[PDB]
Every structure is written in C-alpha cells, then in structure tokens.
A paper describes a structure:
[name] ([name]) is a pentameric protein of 115 kDa composed of five identical non-covalently associated pentraxin domains. The B-face binds to a range of ligands, with the canonical example being phosphocholine (PCh) head groups in lipids such as phosphatidylcholine. This is a calcium-dependent interaction, with each [name] monomer chelating two adjacent Ca2+ ions. The A-face modulates many effector functions of [name], such as activation of the classical complement pathway, where binding of complement component C1q to [name] is mediated via predominantly electrostatic interactions between the Ca2+-containing globular head domain of C1q (gC1q) and the A-face of [name].
Author numbering:
A (entry chain C), B (entry chain B), C (entry chain A), D (entry chain E), E (entry chain D): 1 to 206
Write the structure that this text describes.
C-alpha cells in the first residue's frame, strides 16, 4: 500500500491508452457507497470526460461519474443516469463527493462542499464487488475499450471510497481535509497500477 | 412526539402519491400565525410547486405558500393571493418565514433572514383550526386531489408554526437557529404521518 | 410626545385616503434644514411616490422628497427641483439624509451613508414655518388633495428633522444610529395624527 | 496661510466665471513634480472637465489633468498629451496622484492608490515656475479665457504638489492620509483667492 | 552583482531598440527549469508582446513566454508552443511562474499564485546553456532581430530562474515573497546590460 498524501496523478496529454487502475479489497456487494475525489481539467468547455469509471463483468458503467459538455455532471449507477446540471463553469480545481443508497435510491452530489439536491436513482439495485476501477478513461468493457474522446486530461487525486453513505457532517470534514478512514479505496493506503503516460506529481489544490 | 432536529424530509421523485401530513394540536381559530421552514429544490426554474399547504373543510387553500414559475413566492390566505416576486433565483437551500395578522391584514415574508415589504391580505378574516397540513403536495380537497405537477421535489424541514406574529428580532433568532418554542407546530415535537416515497435524512442546510 | 424608537409606520395598501401628519413646533422660518428618514417600498420599479412632503399655505411643495420612476430621487424646495439620478435600484430598506442651506443653496443628499455630489438649489430662499408635514402622500394643497398614484406603499420611519445642516461626521452618526438630538421634528418625541389605514409596527430595518 | 484640513472647495453650478486660484511660492523651474488631489463630480458621463490646470506665460496647458468623455483621464505637460483610458466609471469620490520627471519623461498616474502603467511624456522638457494654478476651470490664457463647458462641477480638495517624484511607498501614505509635507503647494498651508460662486465646506470623502 | 530588490525595469516607449540582457552563469544544459517574474503592461488588449525571451544560437525561441492577442499566455520550449488561454484580462500587475521538466514534459503555469492545469511539451528535449536572455523584446536571432511589434511596454521585475521545478509549496512562497534562492538567474544578485531607453525605478506592485 502506498500513501499518496499530497500527491496526484497527472494525465498531461489526450490519450486512449494512458490510465491507472485502482484495486479494491472489497469482497461483498455494495448496497451503498460514497466516493470523493479532487480533479482539475480545462476540458470542461471543450468536451466530456470520465472522472471515475467503475465496471463489472455484467455492466461497463456500474458506477460512472462523468462530465457532459454543456450539461454538467452526469452520475450513473447500473447504467441508469441522472444529471446534476451546471449552468456555468469556471476553471479551478473542484472537489466532488457522491453517494448512493440502494435501500432508498437517494443520490447525494456535493461540489466544493456545497450539496446538490438529493435525487432518486436505481433503487433496490446492488453494485457488484468484482470491479475494475479506472481513472483517466471511460471503460466500455471490463478493464478496456477506452475512447480517447472520453479520456480525462489534467489531474485527479484524493480518490476515497466508502461502502456506506457519509453524513453531511462527515462530508464537510472530507472537504476540509480532516481525519477520516475509507474502507474501499483509501488514498493514504492506495493499491494501483499505471499504464502509459501517467505521472505522480505534487497536487495543485491546497 | 418526535424530535426531528437535524433531520429533514426528502421527496426524491416526482409524484402525486407521496406526501407528509402534520398534525396540529390547535383547537381555537387563528387570528394570526407565523410559519417558518427550510426547503431545497431545483424545480424553481422548471415549474411551480407547493411549499406548505394548509386546508380546511370549507377551503382547500386556507394557507398556502407556493412558488410560481418565473414569478416568485405566492402567499395566499383564505384563497386570496399576493405575490412576492423574485427576479432571479439562486440554487441553494432557502429559509422562509411568513406571518399574517387578521387585525391588520399585514403580511410579512422573510427570505434568508431578509424581510420583504409588508403587504395587505384578507384583513378581518379568520383561519379555521380544523385543518389538514400537508408537505410535499398541494391539496385541492381537505386531504387529497393532489396534483403531481404541483408536488415538491427535494427537501423540507424545520417547519415551525406559531399562532402569533413573531417580531423582527425573534424571526432573526429563528433564522440563526436560536432557542425558540412554537405552539401550533413544533419541529422538535412533531406529530406526522408519512405516505409513499418519503424519507427522513440528515439535513443538507447547516 | 411618543417615543417611536424601534417602530415604523406601515402603509400596506395603495390609497389616496391614508396618511399621517407630523407636527413641528416651528416659529422661526427655516434658513436651512436637514431631514433624515428610513423607508422601504417595492414601488421603485412600478411608479413614483412621495417619500416626505412639506407644504405651506403659499406653496404645496415647499420641501418634497420624491422618487421618479427610472429617474431616481427628486428633491425640490420652494417648488423648484433637482434630480439625484439612480442608474439601477435594488429592493432593500434605504436610509436617506438631505440638507439645504439658503445662504449657499448647497444641497447635500446621502443614500445609505454614501454622499451624492453637492448641488445648488434656491439660493437665498426661505422655507416657511407655518407648515404641514405629511408622510405616505404628496400634498397638492395645504394638508390635502392627495393623489393615489403618488402615495407611498410600504414603510417609513426614523423621520428626523433639524433646522441646520448636519456635518458629514454627524450624518454618519445618524446613519449608524448614534446619539443625536433633532430640534424641528424628533422621532423619539414625535407628535402626529394618523388617518385611514396606517399601522405602527416593529421596524424591518436594523 | 490657511489650514484647509478636512475642508473642500465646492463648485455647485456650471459656469465660466467661478474658480479659485492657488499661489505657489516656487522660484525655480520644475524638473519634476508630483500633484495629488481629491475630487468628486457627476460630470464624468456627461462631459469632460478640468481637474487641475497649471499655466505659464508661454503655455496655457503647462500642466493639465483633464477628464475626457468616454476616454478617461488626460494628462498633459507642455501642451503634449497622454491618456490613461478608463473603460467604466463609478460615481464616488476619487483620489489621484500624478508625477512626471524631466530626466526620464516617466509619468506615473495613480487612482485610488492603484498605479497605472508608467508612460513617457516630454523627456527633457522644463516646466516654468511663473505659474497660474486654477481649480474649477480650464484656462486658455494666463489666468483666464475659461470655457464653461470645461468647468468642474462638484468638489475638489487635498490639492498637494511636490517638486519631486514621490516614491510608491510615499504615494500610499498620501492616499491613506499619513503625515507628509508638500513644498510647492500645501493643503495644510494654502494661499488662495476665490472668485464667483465657490464655497468652502466639510469634505465628503473620509 | 546588483541587488534589484524592490526595483523594476521600465520600458516606457514602444521601440525595436530598447532592451536589457541578463547573464546566466549556467554552464550545464537544462533538463528542467522554473522562471518567475512580475510584469505590468496595458498592451494586453492592444497587441501581443514578449514577456521573457531565452535564445540559443541553434534556436531563437528556446524558451519564450509571450502574450498573444485575445488568446492569452503562449509558452514555448524548443520552438514548440502551447497556450494557456485567458478568456478575459484585467489591467493590474501580474505574477507568473512557469516551469518545465524534460523527464516528463510537464509544464506548470501559475498566474498570481493560482495554478493552471499541467500540460505536456517537448518531452525528452534539453535546453541549451549557451543562451541570450532578453527582457523588453523578443529576439529572432541570438541577441537581435528584435521586432517593435513584439516589444514589451511597461514594467518587468523579480525575474528569477531555477534549474529545477519548484514544488507547489515553494511557488507559493515565491508569490508571497518569502526567502528563496535562485541559481540560474537571481534578482537579488543580477548581472545585466541595458540598451536604449530603459529605466530602473521603484516597483509598482507591492
Ligand atoms: C456519460 N455518457 C452517457 C456520455 C457515456 C456513458 O458511457 P458510454 O456509453 O459512452 O460507454
Ligand atoms: C394559487 N396557485 C396557483 C398556487 C394554486 C391554485 O390552484 P390550486 O393549487 O389551488 O389547485
Ligand atoms: C415632484 N414631482 C415633480 C414628481 C411632482 C410634482 O407635482 P405634484 O406631485 O406636486 O402634483
Ligand atoms: C486636450 N484636452 C481636451 C485634454 C484639453 C483641452 O484644453 P483646451 O485646448 O480646451 O484649452
Ligand atoms: C510564436 N509567437 C507568436 C508566440 C512568438 C513569435 O515567434 P517569432 O515572431 O519569433 O517567429
Ligand atoms: Ca462506458
Ligand atoms: Ca465509452
Ligand atoms: Ca389547492
Ligand atoms: Ca391543485
Ligand atoms: Ca404637490
Ligand atoms: Ca401631487
Ligand atoms: Ca488649454
Ligand atoms: Ca479650453
Ligand atoms: Ca523569435
Ligand atoms: Ca519576432
């Protein structure tokens, strides 16, 4: 396990072959989860890109967080999709947290510590545990078929994932960088592999 | 009685079928009242919705607080209506307090602790105490005929009601969340019934 | 004499019938004056209205403070007018102080403690002491002939008048609500009569 | 010599006839200077006006600071002109400092303590000491030929002039009103003559 | 060496002929570098200009930092170019740090302490040490062929250069003016030659 504190992955050129694969130790299906991350990119006015793609053998978009051009954030579970439209965007590092709960279908989406309205999505589903998690690309089969036009360019980091819904109070401590203990992906104890032009560099966000 | 402190009702999907009904202990007709609540919704740009609906067997819109598409807040007593127009809306949680006084007809409306101008409505009227209070829906009979196009989607909470007009100094401490004690409807001692898809979740507003 | 501190007059409906008349112990003619007041209205986009009207039996507009639609504040003395144009208006409570001096014709106008540029009006004139001061309406004759289309709707208060020009440092004290002593017309010792629908209510402004 | 501290000249009517003349004790020609002043006027959207006109027997615009409509500040030395364009202007009191140096032609212009970029003007020139300094008017002969369409309306004060270039760290203390001592023209010790409608009043700026 | 602390170069006229040449003691080629500088100019709306030009006898634009009209900052290494577009520009002093690393091609560009997204440029290249560094102009041959249409007008200073990539934490202390030690080019220990109309004056930025 590597402590990636103060470090970020950099995807400095558009590619369909550069990516990093994050390994989860998870062995029980997710009835709920939270994932939080920092990313920075200038693509937001140019094109859509995949922020965080989670796939399973049955389903290539089992969880996906995606920016869609002129729409805003797209969040999808089990291939069903909802939109958190953004009316205007500025170039700066952005923190997001998203969480979902099978027992209720409630999605929370948080941007820079400000909550979006809760929306229903894909109630009663279960997310598979046998998963391929990739940053930098959108994956259209388990671990592959990346499209260069959906790749991320820029930086991503502080990727943390929990198998439960963080409360609003906890999410505030994540945004402020307080102490917390992830249990699916932990940025302070990450297990990962890198392919192609990807670099680990000091983070640009404070 | 349930203490709903730090908790909110979530109406995560559009329907006419799901609502919450609040029970008042009141047994004397209201010569005056105050209502305060937090709500959060993205509908404000798409369509109108009912924020708080109070009906009596004679009159479905005995008190109604409503958002009118591209108009702003609509406040109506006894079926007579006035508008507090809003020229542009931010998407964030919003606190409102409203109050009315039969002896003068003066309405006050407060948005995020800022007072709107005082207006006149239904001087000399009285509001019935045999009442059905419903959240999430607009009702057109004593307890039903809900219109799905008027339902709320999003969150509501801190719904408090007083049988008297709060002063400007008190309303400020309501907004800042100081000590106070309602007497018609108390969020710390709520009586309610939930129908359909409604969830109680931690509040998103601070 | 009534201490109106923390209280305001409320004019909740458009009418020509409702007004309040303020009495001054004047005997010496006014070689100069200052008048300060708080008011709050939504009319500023809809139509003009009379903020403060001082009439004498020779002259209905002996002092007038008026809002002119799409123009801004109009200030008139002895029936002659100067405009303090406002390029864009916002709906909030607003404090104004205005002062005039016969020996120079210098008019000062202050809005929320921001001074407007000094202007010249009616140098060498004198304002009559045998005066009718009315709030809520525009006098077109001594004490009467009100025009409903010129009535104020909303709130007015902290009306204070001095028979001398307050210095900039004093006026800042008035705006911040420090200690001061009016000598023509004092809100802490007001003499008035109410006619029609006018109410005294707690002030909305701080 | 009069201490004008916290006083200002008021030019409340447009005219060609009213002005004040300031006398300098200077007896050696200026190889460099600084002049700082406060002024306040609403003309900025209506027309140009002379802020500070310095003339010598040979040259009526030996130093001139002039607002030019929809352009911004014009600064001229020896009849040669440069512009410091202002793209949008606001109604508030404004402090300017300007300074020039013969040995380099460097002009510095400062507005509310913010420096404009340094520019070159009339390197090697020499400003005459036999000077008529006039506030309120632009002058086209030594001490006369004023044009009413170039008069200032509003207020001017804190006019201070030095026969050397103030450093950036000094200019900041002029703007903040720290201790300083001019030597060509000193507001603490002014010699002046007033003609026509001009008044000395408490200053509007803090 | 000259300590240029709190001092800046002023280029007050457009010309082909005024420039300063800075001497680097470097004697090993650069696999990476950082350069930071302050500049101030009004040209940004009018035309492009060269902020910092590094040339070698093989290559006129070996490092170049350039502003291109209505595009934004251009940064080039080895004659290959990337853009950090600026959608709107403001007239104030601006501090930029830029850095590059051959081992990765990562470019970092920082404007007023805010990072732009990292980009890829000239991976595996090697910047020559036999170099001519010029301020005020762009050179198109080693030490010459300046074009007046590309000259800088205004101010430049605090030009510091390092033969390594500064971390994000170090770059913040550069921007805040903490203690630091450049090793290719040091503003506190500068060697330079001045040609034509260039002046050394106190800096306008704080
Ligand atoms: C978010 N999206 C709908 C644009 C893409 C979803 O994944 P995919 O269909 O491109 O593989
Ligand atoms: C006044 N209103 C537009 C908000 C609602 C009127 O129709 P209804 O909600 O009573 O059915
Ligand atoms: C002040 N005013 C110019 C707008 C109106 C004057 O006419 P009136 O209001 O006295 O009838
Ligand atoms: C050129 N100017 C408009 C800045 C000043 C004019 O001075 P003048 O030529 O009117 O006397
Ligand atoms: C390429 N540039 C436009 C940014 C700088 C100028 O290049 P060049 O004029 O030396 O050929
Ligand atoms: Ca996919
Ligand atoms: Ca895809
Ligand atoms: Ca109804
Ligand atoms: Ca209905
Ligand atoms: Ca009248
Ligand atoms: Ca009238
Ligand atoms: Ca002239
Ligand atoms: Ca002239
Ligand atoms: Ca070149
Ligand atoms: Ca060139």
């Amino acid at each position: 396990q590597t402590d990636m504190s103060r470090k970020a992955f950099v995807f400095p050129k558009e590619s369909d072959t550069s990516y990093v694969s994050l390994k989860a130790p998870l062995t029980k299906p997710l009835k709920a989860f939270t994932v939080c991350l920092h990313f920075y990119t200038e693509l937001s006015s140019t094109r859509g890109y995949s922020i965080f793609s989670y796939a399973t053998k049955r389903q290539d978009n089992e969880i996906l967080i995606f920016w869609s051009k002129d729409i805003g954030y797209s969040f999808t579970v089990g291939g069903s999709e909802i939109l958190f439209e953004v009316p205007e965007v500025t170039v700066a590092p952005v923190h997001i947290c998203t969480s979902w709960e099978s027992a209720s279908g409630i999605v929370e989406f948080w941007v820079d510590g400000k909550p979006r309205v809760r929306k229903s999505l894909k109630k009663g589903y279960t997310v598979g545990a046998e998963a391929s998690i990739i940053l930098g690309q959108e994956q259209d089969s388990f671990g592959g078929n990346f499209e260069g036009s959906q790749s991320l360019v820029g930086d991503i980091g502080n990727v943390n994932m929990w198998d439960f819904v963080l409360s609003p109070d906890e999410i505030n401590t994540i945004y402020l960088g307080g102490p917390f203990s992830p249990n699916v992906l932990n940025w302070r104890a990450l297990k990962y592999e890198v392919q192609g032009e990807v670099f680990t560099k000091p983070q640009l966000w404070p």
